[PDB]
Design a protein around this ligand. Structure first.
Ligand SMILES: *C(=O)/C=C/c1ccc(O)cc1
Length: 125
């Protein structure tokens, strides 16, 4: 395992050192998005939660293509305000229900330490 707790205050500094292989050792799902919502990184734990194959969703748009259930003011709306503002740090519960059994999760969205990238972290509840 990589030992990093979900919700940790300095998580963006810790994850700045990991490559795709290290990200697969986290105890929670991790997605890195660009400012348009395209998927740059997608770890093994996220694929275990949602059924998606990580290598197949990299490059797709999360809000348009992969996760239309998140295209709502409650999820995408928060993301886009964060990108526009250049700051984002929010945690909320959500249900993922597209082409899968409805699954309740906790989501943490946080701006990355690098400029135009954003993390989405997911764990079951
Ligand atoms: C709603 O459409 C949610 C879909 C979804 C969430 C998270 C993922 O990693 C993949 C699909």
């Amino acid at each position: 395992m990589e030992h990093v707790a979900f919700g940790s205050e300095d998580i963006e500094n810790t994850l700045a050192k990991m490559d795709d292989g290290q990200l697969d050792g986290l105890a929670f799902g991790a997605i890195q998005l660009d400012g348009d919502g395209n998927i740059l990184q997608y770890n093994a734990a996220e694929g275990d939660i949602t059924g998606r194959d990580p290598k197949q969703v990299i490059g797709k748009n999360f809000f348009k293509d992969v996760a239309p259930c998140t295209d709502s003011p409650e999820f995408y709306g928060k993301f886009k305000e964060g990108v526009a503002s250049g700051n984002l740090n929010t945690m909320f519960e959500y249900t993922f229900d597209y082409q899968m059994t409805p699954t309740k999760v906790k989501v943490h969205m946080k701006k990355a330490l690098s400029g135009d990238s954003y993390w989405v972290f997911v764990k079951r509840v």
